[PDB]
């Protein structure tokens, strides 16, 4: 009935990926176990950022599977709503940080340069 739009599409991907078989329970958990350890939003957003970046990476590999394209991009918008608060700038800035190549020689030189001022505001005000 009334449920967030991701629920319908997420369990559709479960069938496409056979995520409903009993063998998935093995080898502990990826995200669910860690997310319960951190209740403070500052701590949560640190972990969720890496998890959201993981799913965006995963969806990018399956951008050619037209069977699930509706479910994929529907989940992406709900992530854009729930995690980025529908802020397009927040979404685009996030996308920029991920696409940075750690092997681009030009990128690492700039990263080492900005390192000082990054550490300067790592701690809270």
């Amino acid at each position: 009935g009334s449920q967030d739009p991701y629920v319908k599409e997420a369990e559709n991907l479960k069938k496409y990926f056979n995520a409903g078989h009993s063998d998935v329970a093995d080898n502990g958990t990826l995200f669910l176990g860690i997310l319960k350890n951190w209740k403070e939003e500052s701590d949560r957003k640190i972990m969720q950022s890496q998890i959201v970046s993981f799913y965006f990476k995963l969806f990018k590999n399956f951008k050619d599977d037209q069977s699930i394209q509706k479910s994929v991009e529907t989940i992406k918008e709900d992530m854009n709503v729930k995690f980025f608060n529908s802020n397009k700038k927040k979404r685009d800035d996030f996308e920029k940080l991920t696409n940075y190549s750690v092997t681009d020689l030009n990128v690492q030189r700039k990263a080492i340069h900005e390192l000082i001022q990054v550490m300067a505001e790592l701690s809270p005000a």
Partner: protein, 213 residues
């Protein structure tokens, strides 16, 4: 080849309705009816054809000059949180027109909210009880909700606005007893992400007399 694009398209965002309409396209040498194709897209996504599989209504290769996303069933249509972009084109077999792309909309941001439905007023001792239904049913109340305002006044008197209040029932206490008061109910949709509001339309004026004591 190339066809003339559909004229003056409009997206109707009233209450929970979501209807895309446009003016028909005609030709001089027309042998069979021209069809149209509607497509939708999210904030940074691919264009999808509006078919029963994608969105639950079949709006591709259709003869009609409108497409109703919310007509099929309850909870159907685009989620009111989403950043949705629609586009449209007319095609006659191999020939098709250019894409007429609508502006992006978020339903909560662009809806024109209607007045509260089924307004019932019962008089009380120097007061009036107002019960009404919400302009439309919202799935997640935490993300968006209604704030109601009542514009009441004694016959021949100056306006007074009581509100806002969250409940669908309110008591207009401290009134002159056995006197006629006229009222209007107007809603206000509040979306916490936007922190900007949609001012709803007012209901019809209706006058009632309070009780004796």
């Amino acid at each position: 080849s190339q066809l003339p694009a559909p004229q003056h398209p409009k997206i109707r965002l009233y209450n929970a309705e979501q209807v895309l309409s446009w003016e028909p396209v005609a030709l001089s040498n027309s042998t069979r009816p021209v069809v149209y194709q509607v497509q939708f897209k999210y904030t940074d996504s691919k264009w999808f054809t509006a078919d029963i599989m994608s969105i639950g209504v079949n709006c591709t290769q259709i003869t009609a000059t409108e497409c109703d996303f919310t007509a099929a069933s309850p909870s159907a249509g685009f989620p009111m949180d989403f950043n949705v972009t629609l586009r449209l084109r007319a095609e006659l077999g191999a020939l098709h027109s250019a894409w007429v792309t609508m502006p992006w909309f978020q339903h909560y941001r662009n809806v024109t909210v209607g007045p509260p439905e089924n307004i019932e007023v019962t008089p009380g001792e120097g007061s009036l009880i107002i019960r009404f239904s919400s302009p439309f049913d919202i799935a997640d109340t935490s993300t968006a909700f209604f704030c109601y305002y009542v514009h009441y006044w004694e016959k021949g008197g100056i306006q007074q606005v009581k509100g806002p209040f969250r409940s669908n029932s309110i008591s207009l206490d401290n009134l002159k007893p056995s006197r006629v008061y006229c009222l209007q109910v107007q809603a206000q949709l509040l979306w916490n992400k936007s922190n900007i509001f949609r001012v709803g339309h007012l209901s019809n004026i209706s006058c009632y007399e309070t009780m004796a004591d």
